[PDB]
Nucleic acid binder design. Structure first.
Ligand SMILES: [K+]
Lengths: 49, 100, 120, 246, 228, 31, 157
RNA sequence: CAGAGUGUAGCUUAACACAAAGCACCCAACUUACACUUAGGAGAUUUCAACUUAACUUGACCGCUCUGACCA
């Protein structure tokens, strides 16, 4: 588990940004969250923290 | 019984004058406390300048103070020569006891 | 077809909207705002302005809230705003002052839900 | 390895010693109100406003409009307080406001609104629609003079043009009726432009109407520099915005 | 030593004996609360007893009725005469007696003679080494003439201070003036004897407290003397 | 003032009506 | 991130009281009384509940910690009167004594002189005030009497 | 008594004007009570002038505060 896409990386819609067992990172703009607190990209673009 | 329009009108208008009357009771009580506290703190300062030995005794607590008992006023004062009837006081307070 | 700012599922309020109705009621006044997701304010209606204050007995009562919706709905139609979301709290939504502000906005022609975005 | 903060941290002011003698929030709306204040403040760390916020220039946008009116605040405030006392003295307004049956006249609210704070609202609205950015390259102005435009549809109806309301090209096939308060001896100039209608150049605009050297309020007497041409938004091109400038 | 004399003053109070009268607004509200308390209450055993009898009497073994029993109670009440909230000292206006003005709080005032001049002040005693400032106030009661009163002192800190200067006659580098510190107390029980009453002392409400005291001495006493 | 917190009503949903009376004490006083 | 300057920006548990699972009684310093019990006993149940509610709100306005506000068991008292020209005591009335308590901690020595004079002034008619220091005896007076433990204790003796 | 200082309802470095704001506060209902919430309530620029905008600047007029005079 952990970050799959770091700051500045380009992602496509659906790409998983981070996996976690507890909420270490929270979903912001155009970032979804699944059952298991998995953060995924809702749009194509650049990742920012 | 249903309440007449004039009745509710009077009650509602009475609770609007009662919210402002209690606002002045609290204002006087708030100011009175301030006066008391401002006079006490200012007297202690003048006492420190005169003799810091007495100021160290005044700021100390008074163990004789508590327990502090006080009964509330009456509606009519005691009569000088009044003899009550004869009787007896019997407690019937249910005693509760814990088993198990 | 414009994308909404989806996300923010672990916080409050949401951002998945184009326009938002935000109600601010203080100890003395009541204010309703229509603002865009970017923060800009489009139209507003407050009891601080003489126009509305000269006709109200109390600026902080239910009537004031009901009258702020009748004035805001009329201003949202002129601006072109016909849909917007409202994000209240459980105690705000159950209040009789917010129930009358919504009814006043709908009777004015404003819909308190935005249409779904078209992706395809 | 540790790096020292570049500035004051969020909750440093708080005193942890007397943590049991500090006023708490006790409510979710009181924390939320403080959380919105600190969210709209500048910070040295990365923020959502940095990456998504609409970038602006530090050079304050210049004002090219008319000067404001001069009003006596003291004489204004005195008259307003007196009117509220009369309105509040009447027991029929108190009873209606307590029974929740009172209502304000929407027609009088809008006439006084147009006089006091309507210009500033219309300005805020034009900035949202992007008119100052496109027309004047960022320069702003307050519309002190209410401009009342209305299209004649039929023989009894009217379609008022406000600030962003939808109007069809069928209703706007003939020139509208334009009225505005002006003194005698003054000269004006009206104008209608399509900001988004252009088919070839993005930045450019189409001129739909230009009336010059208008005496007072009489629009017909003004010279017709460019005849009226109805809007012609292409199909599948979206929604356009036409502006009347006075 | 210092050029300021230390004096331990005392502010003895007789708290209310009776409840204060209700104001016109409190009356309108108290009648409503008892009216609201009835409209939202269940029938009492005395109301169900009367209703049942009304039906049984209407149809046709209870010897005593409800309305009949109420009359007995009222008779005994009209026979009992209550104590007077307004005493003879309120009509005679004897400001030396505790019994007067039962509803309001009273403050003690004793007249002392300084420089061949009579002045009203609060009981006070000069401080002595080997004694707390409050201990000086506890002593004042003992110095009072033919007094049998038990006072309850509230804390050790003073509730007020007054400073004055000798009017350039007794002024000296050794003695410039005085500094009195007041301590509040409550009069649990007791009163003076009947030997000397009038010229000695009076018990005065805070409103009528100015007549006796001086302007400057009054302003400092009206700060810790409440009239709640 | 004694009237600060004296004006009240029974704050119960269900309760039997209560009547006001004078409780004469062993010294003549009343409440 | 630990190496970054914005490390620790999410720390929140140093702002919260340590709540990590009866009560040890606080004993006052020379300058401040530790704990106090304000007892409000009255024959009327509305006057005790209202004066207690006044003291609780007054203490808050004055920034005084109210540890606990509770009630004590009611005491019912049958009042018998000597029958007219006789010797048998006949039931006259039934009086109930109602008591309310307001537990406060953190009262300064100097300020108690003031706080006490305020409450005793606003004391209603028929209501009695008693301010005592808290003791385990009081806390054990609110619990039911265990008689099984008293028989077993006697056997040990 | 003069001497200086001081000036929005309780606080505020709220007040560009579009406007006297925000919080604190009071009653009732919910709550053992408190708190939360809902529904209601009361409110201020010391007063006059100054070419006007003047709560803001300049003057006094007003009260407050402080240091002595005064003082038992
Ligand atoms: K175009």
């Amino acid at each position: 588990q952990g970050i799959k896409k770091m700051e500045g990386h380009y992602v496509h819609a659906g790409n998983i940004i981070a996996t976690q067992r507890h909420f270490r990172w929270h979903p912001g703009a155009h970032v979804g969250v699944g059952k298991n607190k998995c953060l995924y990209a809702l749009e194509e673009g650049i990742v920012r923290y | 019984v249903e309440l007449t329009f004039e009745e509710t009108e009077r009650r509602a208008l009475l609770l609007k004058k009662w919210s402002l009357y209690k606002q002045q009771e609290r204002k006087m009580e708030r100011d009175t406390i301030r006066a008391m506290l401002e006079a006490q703190q200012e007297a202690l300062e003048e006492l420190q300048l005169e003799s810091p030995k007495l100021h160290a005794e005044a700021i100390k607590r008074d163990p004789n103070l508590f327990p502090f008992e006080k009964e509330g006023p009456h509606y009519t004062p005691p009569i000088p020569n009044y003899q009550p009837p004869e009787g007896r006081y019997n407690d019937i307070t249910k005693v509760y006891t814990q088993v198990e | 077809v414009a994308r909404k700012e989806r996300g923010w599922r672990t916080v409050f309020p949401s951002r998945e909207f184009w326009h938002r109705l935000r109600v601010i009621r203080t100890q003395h006044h009541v204010e309703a705002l229509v603002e865009h997701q970017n923060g800009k304010v489009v139209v507003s209606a407050s009891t601080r302005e003489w126009a509305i204050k000269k006709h109200l007995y109390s600026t902080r009562n239910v009537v004031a809230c009901e009258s702020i919706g009748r004035v805001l709905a009329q201003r949202c139609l002129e601006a072109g705003i016909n849909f917007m979301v409202y994000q209240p709290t459980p105690w705000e939504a159950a209040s009789d002052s917010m129930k009358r502000l919504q009814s006043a906005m709908t009777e004015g022609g404003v819909v308190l839900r935005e249409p779904q975005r078209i992706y395809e | 390895r540790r790096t020292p903060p570049l500035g004051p941290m969020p909750n440093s002011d708080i005193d942890l010693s007397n943590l049991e003698r500090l006023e708490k929030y006790r409510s979710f709306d009181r924390y939320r109100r403080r959380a919105e204040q600190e969210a709209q403040a500048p910070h040295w760390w990365r923020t959502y406003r940095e990456y998504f916020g609409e970038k602006t220039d530090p050079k304050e946008k210049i004002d090219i409009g008319l000067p404001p009116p001069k009003v006596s605040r003291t004489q204004q405030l005195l008259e307003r307080k007196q009117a509220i006392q009369e309105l509040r003295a009447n027991v029929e307004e108190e009873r209606a406001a307590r029974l929740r049956t009172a209502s304000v006249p929407l027609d009088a609210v809008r006439a006084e609104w147009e006089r006091t704070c309507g210009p500033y609202h219309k300005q805020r609205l034009a900035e949202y629609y992007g008119l100052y950015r496109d027309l004047f390259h960022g320069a702003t102005f307050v519309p002190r003079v209410p401009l009342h435009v209305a299209y004649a549809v039929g023989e009894d109806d009217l379609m008022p043009v406000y600030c962003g309301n939808e109007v069809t090209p069928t209703e706007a096939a003939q020139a509208p009726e334009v009225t505005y308060e002006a003194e005698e001896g003054s000269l004006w100039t009206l104008l209608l432009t399509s900001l988004d209608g252009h088919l070839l150049e993005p930045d450019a605009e189409y001129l739909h109407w230009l009336l010059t050297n208008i005496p007072g309020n009489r629009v017909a007497e003004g010279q017709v520099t460019c005849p009226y041409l109805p809007p012609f938004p292409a199909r599948g091109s979206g929604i356009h915005r036409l502006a009347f400038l006075l | 030593g210092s050029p300021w004399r230390l004096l331990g003053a005392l502010c003895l109070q007789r708290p209310p004996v009776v409840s204060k009268p209700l104001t016109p607004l409190q009356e309108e509200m108290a009648s409503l609360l008892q009216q609201i308390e009835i409209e939202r209450s269940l029938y009492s055993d005395h109301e169900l007893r009367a209703l049942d009898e009304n039906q049984r009497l209407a149809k046709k073994q209870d010897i005593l009725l409800a309305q009949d029993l109420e009359d007995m109670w009222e008779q005994k009440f009209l026979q009992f005469k209550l104590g007077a909230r307004i005493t003879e000292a309120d009509e005679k206006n004897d400001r030396t007696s505790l019994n007067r003005k039962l509803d309001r709080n009273l403050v003690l005032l004793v007249r002392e003679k300084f420089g061949d001049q009579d002045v009203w002040i609060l009981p006070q005693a000069e401080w002595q080494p080997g004694e707390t400032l409050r201990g000086t106030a506890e002593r004042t009661l003992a110095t009072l003439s033919e007094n049998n009163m038990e006072a309850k002192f509230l804390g050790n800190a003073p509730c007020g201070h007054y400073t004055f200067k000798f009017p350039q006659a007794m002024r000296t580098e050794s003695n410039l003036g005085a500094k009195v510190f007041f301590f509040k107390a409550l009069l649990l029980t007791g009163d003076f004897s009947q030997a000397g009453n009038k010229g000695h002392h009076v018990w005065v409400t805070k409103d009528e407290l100015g007549d006796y005291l001086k302007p400057k001495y009054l302003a400092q006493v009206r700060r810790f003397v409440s009239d709640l | 003032d004694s009237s600060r917190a004296s004006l009240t009503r029974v704050h119960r949903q269900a309760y039997a009506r209560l009547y006001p009376v004078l409780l004469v004490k062993q010294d003549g006083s009343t409440i | 991130y630990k190496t970054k300057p914005t490390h620790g920006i999410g720390k929140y548990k140093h702002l919260i009281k340590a709540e990590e699972p009866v009560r040890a009684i606080n004993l006052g310093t020379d300058y401040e009384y530790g704990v106090l019990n304000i007892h409000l006993t009255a024959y009327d149940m509305t006057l005790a509940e209202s004066y207690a509610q006044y003291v609780h709100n007054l203490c808050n306005s004055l920034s005084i910690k109210v540890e606990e506000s509770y009630a004590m068991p009611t005491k019912t008292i049958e009042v018998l009167q000597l029958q007219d020209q006789g010797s048998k005591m006949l039931l006259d009335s039934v009086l109930t004594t109602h008591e309310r308590v307001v537990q406060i901690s953190g009262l300064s020595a100097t300020f108690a002189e003031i706080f006490l004079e305020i409450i005793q002034s606003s004391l209603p008619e028929g209501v009695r005030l008693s301010v005592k220091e808290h003791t385990e005896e009081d806390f054990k007076g609110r619990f039911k009497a265990r008689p099984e433990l008293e028989e077993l204790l006697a056997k040990l003796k």
